[PDB]
Design an enzyme around this catalytic site. Structure first.
Site, PDB file in Angstrom:
ATOM      1  N   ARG A  29       0.861  -1.173   0.000  1.00  0.00           N
ATOM      2  CA  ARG A  29       0.000   0.000   0.000  1.00  0.00           C
ATOM      3  C   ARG A  29       0.902   1.229   0.000  1.00  0.00           C
ATOM      4  O   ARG A  29       1.764   1.392   0.870  1.00  0.00           O
ATOM      5  CB  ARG A  29      -0.923  -0.059   1.211  1.00  0.00           C
ATOM      6  CG  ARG A  29      -1.698   1.199   1.570  1.00  0.00           C
ATOM      7  CD  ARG A  29      -2.688   1.550   0.482  1.00  0.00           C
ATOM      8  NE  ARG A  29      -3.643   2.587   0.853  1.00  0.00           N
ATOM      9  CZ  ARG A  29      -3.448   3.898   0.749  1.00  0.00           C
ATOM     10  NH1 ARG A  29      -2.321   4.424   0.283  1.00  0.00           N
ATOM     11  NH2 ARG A  29      -4.407   4.744   1.122  1.00  0.00           N
ATOM     12  N   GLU A  37     -10.074   5.828  -5.027  1.00  0.00           N
ATOM     13  CA  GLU A  37     -10.298   4.400  -4.981  1.00  0.00           C
ATOM     14  C   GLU A  37     -10.912   3.816  -6.246  1.00  0.00           C
ATOM     15  O   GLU A  37     -11.960   4.290  -6.691  1.00  0.00           O
ATOM     16  CB  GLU A  37     -11.245   4.089  -3.807  1.00  0.00           C
ATOM     17  CG  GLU A  37     -11.402   2.596  -3.559  1.00  0.00           C
ATOM     18  CD  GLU A  37     -10.312   2.083  -2.634  1.00  0.00           C
ATOM     19  OE1 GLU A  37     -10.397   0.910  -2.221  1.00  0.00           O
ATOM     20  OE2 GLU A  37      -9.391   2.880  -2.346  1.00  0.00           O
ATOM     21  N   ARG A  81      -1.043  -5.699   4.302  1.00  0.00           N
ATOM     22  CA  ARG A  81      -0.296  -5.045   3.227  1.00  0.00           C
ATOM     23  C   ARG A  81       0.938  -4.326   3.744  1.00  0.00           C
ATOM     24  O   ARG A  81       0.928  -3.690   4.792  1.00  0.00           O
ATOM     25  CB  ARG A  81      -1.192  -4.048   2.479  1.00  0.00           C
ATOM     26  CG  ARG A  81      -2.471  -4.662   1.933  1.00  0.00           C
ATOM     27  CD  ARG A  81      -3.384  -3.629   1.308  1.00  0.00           C
ATOM     28  NE  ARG A  81      -3.859  -2.591   2.223  1.00  0.00           N
ATOM     29  CZ  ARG A  81      -4.597  -1.560   1.825  1.00  0.00           C
ATOM     30  NH1 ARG A  81      -4.961  -1.390   0.557  1.00  0.00           N
ATOM     31  NH2 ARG A  81      -5.011  -0.641   2.679  1.00  0.00           N
TER      32      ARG A  81
END
Length: 135
Positions: A29, A37, A81
């Protein structure tokens, strides 16, 4: 901070890329950026989001060398992540996205703030130039 070699596997989004790091696959990330998004449920993607994704994808897909840079805070989120700065042939994707007006600088997370001023500066410039999300 230290840069570590990685290899592109796949770009997922403007803010998420899948890399081979220390021999195993992993999803990263992008630290300190807030993007429109694209990988979402009933959200019908987002305004500029497909440009942020194409940007990130162009940048890493064409690079000769990908490097990852963890910060000094927490290194993974609750979804597993990695939280890092990604570099494409020496150029930081995090910063490029912001300089280009395709992301905002996010709130700092768990002590991860080494490149926040650099990032806030790129952000003012883009605002001033009325780039993409600041258009």
């Amino acid at each position: 901070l230290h840069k570590e070699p990685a290899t592109l596997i796949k770009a997922i989004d403007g803010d998420t890329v899948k890399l081979m790091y220390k021999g195993q696959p992993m999803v990263f990330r992008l630290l300190l950026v807030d993007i429109p998004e694209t990988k979402h449920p009933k959200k019908g993607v987002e305004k500029y989001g497909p440009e942020a994704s194409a940007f990130t994808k162009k940048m890493v897909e064409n690079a000769k060398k990908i490097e990852v840079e963890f910060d000094k805070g927490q290194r993974t989120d609750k979804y597993g992540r990695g939280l890092a700065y990604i570099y494409a042939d020496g150029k930081m994707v995090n910063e490029a996205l912001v300089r280009q007006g395709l992301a905002k600088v996010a709130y700092v997370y768990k002590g991860n703030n080494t490149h926040e001023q650099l990032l806030r500066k790129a952000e003012a410039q883009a605002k001033k130039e009325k780039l993409n999300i600041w258009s």
